[PDB]
Amino acid sequence: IIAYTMSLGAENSVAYSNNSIAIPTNFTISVTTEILPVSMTKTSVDCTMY
């Protein structure tokens, strides 16, 4: 078991210039999921029985 300092991620310096742009030449299609709860169990309680 090793304890370390977490790293925020990778690091790059994008090559900015005042007369240069980057344009994509290909593409991909991706499918992702997301899960959302919408309901919880319906319950009832009686006093005198409890």
Binding site: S20, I21, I23, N26, F27, T32, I35, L36, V38, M40
Partner: protein
Amino acid sequence: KRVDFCGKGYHLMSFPQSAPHGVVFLHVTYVPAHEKNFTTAPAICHDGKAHFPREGVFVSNGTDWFVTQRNFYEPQIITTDNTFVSGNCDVVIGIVNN
């Protein structure tokens, strides 16, 4: 059209699926890739006038200069139909002769 609301990237469509106490969304998104680097100029000087692109951007692979769309590389020759004129070019910072 609101960014990152459903799917990481440009949104195309979605499909729902049931769940024991919830819902599951399958989001289909478009992600560009395989970028290339080019030289750019904001306007073109011709006959002393300035030309701007209707939709697209000027690029060049060293020479020639073409107009493309912003999300997919597809060069086309520059014509008076896909550009419009605005005054004489003396105030625009970045004009190139063509």
